Design a protein around this ligand. Structure first.
Ligand SMILES: [Mg+2]
Ligand SMILES: [Mg+2]
Ligand SMILES: [Mg+2]
Ligand SMILES: [Mg+2]
Ligand SMILES: [Mg+2]
Ligand SMILES: [Mg+2]
Ligand SMILES: [Mg+2]
Ligand SMILES: [Mg+2]
Ligand SMILES: [Mg+2]
Ligand SMILES: [Mg+2]
Ligand SMILES: [Mg+2]
Ligand SMILES: [Mg+2]
Ligand SMILES: [Mg+2]
Ligand SMILES: [Mg+2]
Ligand SMILES: [Mg+2]
Ligand SMILES: [Mg+2]
Ligand SMILES: [Mg+2]
Ligand SMILES: [Mg+2]
Ligand SMILES: [Mg+2]
Ligand SMILES: [Mg+2]
Ligand SMILES: [Mg+2]
Ligand SMILES: [Mg+2]
Lengths: 82, 205, 80, 156, 122, 129
RNA sequence: UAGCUAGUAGGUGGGGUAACGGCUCACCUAGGCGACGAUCCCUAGCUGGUCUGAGAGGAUGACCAGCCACACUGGAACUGA
RNA sequence: CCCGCAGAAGAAGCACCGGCUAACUCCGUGCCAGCAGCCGCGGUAAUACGGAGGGUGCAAGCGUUAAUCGGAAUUACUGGGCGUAAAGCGCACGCAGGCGGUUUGUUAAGUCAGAUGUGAAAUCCCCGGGCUCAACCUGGGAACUGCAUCUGAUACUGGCAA
């Protein structure tokens, strides 16, 4: 039901996703419960590129929230690089 | 989107040398600078206050080669920034890339500087910047790429710039054809014949 | 510590029911004048004690009828 | 050193048995751009004579304004007949934001940054009188501290 | 003026009325010309102004002025009208748009060509 | 009927200054005494005193500097028909600090400068310039 | 547009609902709302916001987002969390 | 996005010029034709009609129309008036309502101070970052002037008692 996934903001051809925990039934860019970070696929050097609040994500997962595949890969990458 | 007409006609109508010619000759030897253009030029126009404000704004615009929409955006930004609105507007205009390359001397006029910038002769911080209105920041380095460093107009304009007065907020090496934007200029460094307050009032009407 | 209101009984002509009036002193949004405003409530009073003119403390509770959702707590200045 | 400015010139008339007689009136304002300003009203048969007489009359009867660095000490209100004027000090660089008569008087008196607005009738003569009156009935920290028996630091 | 009085009866705005009601807040309207004729202006003017009575697509019948020097307008011609009143001509509150559906551009114009629907001469 | 004694007091002060009277007298109350104390400490009147056991009369000795009246303008702000209350942030600046507004805060009546320094709001009795 | 309201306002009991309840029924009481605008008529999706304005305000509710209502017109239930 | 070829070669229009409002002369017409936001123009010298030259303002746009706010302090809370300009009921009594001389005590309702929760994100604003710049996108903050609760102050207003 409650999931953690990416909402696609930004401009044409330059995506910028917003990692938010939301009810699965809502629209992709629609109603969400909480924002837990961001992910810029076209990020350049010296830019964060990916910021995830691991504490809140852990809280929601413990409450039963699911993690979309891409968000899982982002979490893996973050915990592997740092 | 660019004024392609006679430049000395503008200089006469504003009644002042706007530096639209290279400076090899005198503007009095190139035109009748004392007479406004057109058939009824000898007339003595008793321009009103709105007239003087408009003439000042047009003088600054015709000095810098900036159209009205972009100039008004400049004014909005300057008024938004902290400090003094007129000095901020003149600071932005001086921070224009065309203006910078003209000041350092890789161009006889600002039209020639703009032509270089457009035709990709100029590099800021090592990258070719095509956009003429690009705002150079303090400590930026503006150098001419070699394939246009060979061009003779650069050399001739450099000699003319050495002939002219030198800016105090820019440091240039002609042999390397590179310059540094040391700091934002001030009203002490900007020509005191401009009256920015007229422009401020005009755009606040 | 329970959120309660304090008002004046306006009528007691119903069985196990009174209509109190809470008076609130509120600044007018536009003109800044402080204007008196009244809200009329129906209050459930078991034992039918409260008479017209009393000052009553009321607490909001679960619905008890179509229009009654406030219940009596105590009576202050029971003298009419 | 006195900057001078003509605000308005009008053609008034006086009906006589033989016809109409048209004369010209000129309102001018003079000032030293450093806190002294006066206005003059001059009447003549011709415009040059009228402006000359008005300039002389305004060069006389000047008054002193307590200017603080080219700006007003505090908001002032002025009124003469049906013209009511409001003047407020403003930060450096805003320029002089005022209508024509107020613009002329303040520019010649030396105020460089001020927010102004005229209510009621904008008849130039009364607007000039009202703004000059408001500029004159303005008190500075020095005089206010002296008047209340305090120090300027005590007044802040 | 008293605060209490304004509380009991707030300031009530004067309701603006439009000067071109037959347009119904539209920039232009199509109509079918019902009678082309000439009229006489109010004095201090003297001329023969060209006007047309038009039935609009929303049911209104209105008088519209035909500016310029020369019109091919006759009965049953479909024209486009816009707001704008001819001050010295009572009852006329609209203009016909020259260069629009059937109002042809006035011949032999070199200025205000966009205002009179005249193409650029070659 | 007299329904704003504070406004009456300010009106007597204004009229006495316009009529070049040495001193003015009015019926006393503790709010009036507090206001007169504030005016005296801010230097707008030369002195005040109270005379009387059962019906006290407040006498204010007014101040003139160069022939002209010291109080240039004084206007009641909060009035019975419209009470004015201001939070500490929105306390007014009268004549850009050259004058003083008398504010009644929870710790007594004081000037706007004193209330802003003490971090308090309150009712706005009057402006004095 | 100055009076509106008989399930109308409240109460006891039964039934009904996932849930309180005139939600419904029987009986009893004669109430309830209204000049702080009830009822009636006209217009209208609401908001974050957008434009303007020095501000207070005025107009406004396209796109984006939250909520509501509708699915040719009127009515009704079934399946199902 | 970068590199190479060719050659100024493929690329300037719209409105206006009597005052308000920046920018004026000639010719044609002659209360006609026509212009017009307002004032207004035209009856034989028209800077106001039509063309030309010149000029002014914007510029891949420029004008006209429609609509909202502003200017309009012209519904005035901020911020208006009522002898004669529009505007004090013929006059009085008076219910509801609005306002309340002075002192002390108590309460803490209005009022003020602090804290907590909330005031979705986006939007506006500030400091930065990324698209060659800008538009645009975006990190953080501030704001969301509000509401509710708790703890205090009691001057003023309100309640109560004398
Ligand atoms: Mg463009
Ligand atoms: Mg119910
Ligand atoms: Mg005289
Ligand atoms: Mg007027
Ligand atoms: Mg039951
Ligand atoms: Mg509808
Ligand atoms: Mg305004
Ligand atoms: Mg609305
Ligand atoms: Mg079922
Ligand atoms: Mg002119
Ligand atoms: Mg002629
Ligand atoms: Mg319009
Ligand atoms: Mg208004
Ligand atoms: Mg009036
Ligand atoms: Mg009358
Ligand atoms: Mg009478
Ligand atoms: Mg009292
Ligand atoms: Mg309290
Ligand atoms: Mg950048
Ligand atoms: Mg942002
Ligand atoms: Mg928000
Ligand atoms: Mg008391």
């Amino acid at each position: 039901m409650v999931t953690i996934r990416l909402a696609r903001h930004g401009a044409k051809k330059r995506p910028f996703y917003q990692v938010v925990v939301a009810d699965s039934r809502n629209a992709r860019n629609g109603r969400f419960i909480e924002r837990v970070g961001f992910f810029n696929p076209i990020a350049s050097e010296k830019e964060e590129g990916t910021r995830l609040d691991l504490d809140r994500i852990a809280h929601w997962v413990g409450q039963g929230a699911t993690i979309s595949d891409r968000v899982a890969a982002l979490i893996k990458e973050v915990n592997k690089a740092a | 989107a660019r004024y392609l007409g006679p430049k000395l006609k503008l200089s006469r109508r504003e009644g002042t040398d706007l530096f639209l010619k290279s400076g090899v000759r005198a503007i009095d030897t190139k035109c009748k600078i004392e007479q406004a253009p057109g058939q009824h030029g000898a007339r003595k126009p008793r321009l009103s206050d709105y007239g003087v404000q408009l003439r000042e704004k047009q003088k600054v615009r015709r000095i810098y080669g900036v159209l009205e929409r972009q100039f008004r955006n400049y004014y909005k930004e300057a008024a938004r920034l902290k400090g003094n609105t007129g000095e901020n507007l003149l600071a932005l205009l001086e921070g224009r890339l065309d203006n910078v390359v003209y000041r350092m001397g890789f161009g006889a006029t600002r039209a020639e500087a703009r032509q270089l910038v457009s035709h990709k002769a100029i590099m800021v911080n090592g990258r070719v910047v095509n956009i003429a209105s690009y705002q150079v920041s303090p400590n930026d380095v503006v150098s001419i790429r070699e394939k246009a460093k060979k061009q003779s107009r650069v050399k001739a304009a450099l000699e003319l710039a050495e002939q002219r007065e030198k800016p105090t907020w820019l440091e240039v090496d002609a042999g390397k054809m590179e310059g540094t934007f040391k700091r934002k200029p001030e009203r002490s460094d900007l020509s005191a014949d401009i009256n920015e307050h007229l422009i401020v009032e005009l755009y606040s009407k | 510590k329970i959120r309660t209101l304090q008002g004046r009984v306006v009528s007691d002509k119903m069985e196990k029911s009174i209509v109190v009036a809470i008076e609130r002193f509120v600044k007018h949004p536009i003109y800044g004048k402080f204007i008196k405003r009244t809200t009329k409530l129906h209050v459930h009073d078991e034992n039918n004690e409260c008479g017209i003119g009393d000052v009553v403390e009321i607490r909001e509770c679960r619905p008890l009828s179509k229009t009654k959702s406030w219940t009596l707590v105590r009576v202050v200045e029971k003298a009419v | 050193e006195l900057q001078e400015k003509l605000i308005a010139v009008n053609r008034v008339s006086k009906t006589v048995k033989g016809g109409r007689i048209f004369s010209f009136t000129a309102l001018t304002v003079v000032g030293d751009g450093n806190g002294r300003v006066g206005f003059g009203y001059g009447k003549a048969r011709e415009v040059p004579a009228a402006i000359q007489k008005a300039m002389e009359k305004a060069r006389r009867n000047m008054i002193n304004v307590a200017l603080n660095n080219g700006t007003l000490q505090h908001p002032v209100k002025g009124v003469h007949t049906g013209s009511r004027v409001f003047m407020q000090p403003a930060s450096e660089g805003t320029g002089i934001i005022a209508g024509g008569a107020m613009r002329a008087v303040l520019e010649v008196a030396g105020v460089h940054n001020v927010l102004a607005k005229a209510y009621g009738s904008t008849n130039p003569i009364n607007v000039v009188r009202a703004t000059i009156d408001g500029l004159e009935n303005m008190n500075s920290p020095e005089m206010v501290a002296a008047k209340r028996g305090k120090s300027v630091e005590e007044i802040l | 003026a008293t605060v209490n009085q304004l509380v009991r009866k707030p300031r009530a705005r004067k309701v603006a009325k439009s000067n071109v009601p037959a347009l119904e807040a539209c920039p232009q309207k199509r109509g079918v010309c019902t009678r082309v004729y000439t009229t006489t202006p109010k004095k201090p003017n003297s001329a023969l102004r060209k006007v047309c009575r038009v039935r609009l697509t929303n049911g209104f019948e209105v008088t519209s002025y035909i500016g310029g020097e020369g019109h091919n307008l006759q009965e049953h011609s479909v024209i486009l009208i816009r707001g704008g009143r001819v001050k010295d001509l009572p009852g006329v509150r609209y203009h016909t748009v020259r260069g629009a559906l059937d109002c042809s551009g006035v011949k032999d114009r070199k200025q205000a060509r966009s205002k009179y629907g005249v193409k650029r001469p070659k | 009927s007299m329904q704003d004694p504070i406004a009456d007091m300010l009106t007597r002060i204004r009229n006495g200054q316009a009529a070049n009277k040495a001193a003015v007298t009015m019926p006393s109350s503790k709010l009036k005494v507090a206001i007169a104390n504030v005016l005296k400490e801010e230097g707008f009147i030369e002195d005040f005193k109270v005379e009387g056991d059962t019906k006290p009369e407040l006498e204010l000795t007014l101040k003139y500097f160069q022939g002209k009246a010291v109080v240039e303008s004084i206007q009641r702000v909060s009035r019975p028909g419209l009470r004015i209350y201001k939070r500490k942030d929105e306390l007014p600046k009268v004549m850009a600090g050259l004058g003083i507004a008398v504010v009644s805060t929870s710790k007594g009546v004081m000037t706007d400068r004193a209330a802003r320094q003490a971090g308090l709001g309150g009712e706005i009795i009057c402006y004095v310039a």
